Amino acid sequence: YDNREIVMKYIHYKLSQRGYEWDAVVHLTLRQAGDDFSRRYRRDFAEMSSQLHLTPFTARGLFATVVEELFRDGVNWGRIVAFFEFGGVMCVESVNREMSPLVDNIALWMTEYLNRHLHTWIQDNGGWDAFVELYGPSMR
């Protein structure tokens, strides 16, 4: 699969859910998984969003530190869903705070992390098709 396309379509959906139109089965499964995750952890996401205080000064370090901590001792599909939802949080905060150019940066950072850090794990664990299979019983 093309990880950049996965990132771009995911972010476009997170932003469209906030009323923002960003000029950029796997997609739909990831879409529902991320929504289920942030609905399940609504209070936690609300607290994260209120402490982000996102600025162009802090965005790169925020992203790198959260993601490094998230995968500190390894990878699983839940942590990958969390990675996408956290990227979505940063993008929504970007447009909310009239910092919409940061969305382009965040999408680049997410694509670079998926391609150059998570790729070997995704490949060794059956690829995105394995994720579709695992989450399939939770769809609809």
């Binding site: 995750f37 399940r40 994260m48 959260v66 901590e69 500190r72 699983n76 969390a82």
Partner: peptide, 21 residues
């Protein structure tokens, strides 16, 4: 330290979530 805290909580939640599949 905000980002370190966010990442740790996201990790915990993630591991709970994947157990729910």
């Amino acid at each position: 330290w905000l980002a370190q805290r966010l990442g740790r909580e996201l990790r915990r939640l993630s591991d709970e979530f994947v157990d729910s599949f």
